[PDB]
């Protein structure tokens, strides 16, 4: 299974960003996309993430309000928009999904507002962003 993104981009403080992450399967609803970054020298940080089969969306503590995230239903892609671009955000952005098929084996009704982000497998190629 493939998961490709858009290309690298440069930014300015005050503008926004439109980075995409387009799938390879039939639809998006079988996969639970996420959006992780990698600051240079340090590890990774889970910024945002969407599950389209329940219509939910989850965020971290810091990146609320600045980040909106939309998954386009037609062409099997998910966007990642962010405003308030400061110099700490100079990093590479990674989209990574997993299988949503494990939620069905839970007993009866499940948490539909909850999150089942675990064991990402189809990590994309990485989009490097920088602000100037």
């Amino acid at each position: 299974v493939q998961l490709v993104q858009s290309g690298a981009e440069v930014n300015k403080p005050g503008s926004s960003v439109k980075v995409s992450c387009q799938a390879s399967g039939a639809t998006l609803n079988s996969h639970a996309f996420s959006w992780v970054r990698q600051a240079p020298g340090q590890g990774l940080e889970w910024m945002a993430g969407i599950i389209p089969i329940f219509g939910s969306s989850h965020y971290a503590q810091k990146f609320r309000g600045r980040v909106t995230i939309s998954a386009d239903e037609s062409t099997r892609t998910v966007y990642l928009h962010l405003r308030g671009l400061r110099s700490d955000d100079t990093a590479v952005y990674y989209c990574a999904s997993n299988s949503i098929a494990g939620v069905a084996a839970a007993g009866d009704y499940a948490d539909y507002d909850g999150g089942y982000y675990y064991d990402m497998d189809v990590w994309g190629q990485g989009t490097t962003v920088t602000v100037s």
Binding site: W46, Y59, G114, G115, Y116, Y117, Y118
Partner: peptide
């Protein structure tokens, strides 16, 4: 890395 979900922060934490 060591990544998992944390419901108290309501987000995945690495």
């Amino acid at each position: 890395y060591c990544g998992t979900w944390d419901s108290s922060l309501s987000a995945v934490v690495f």
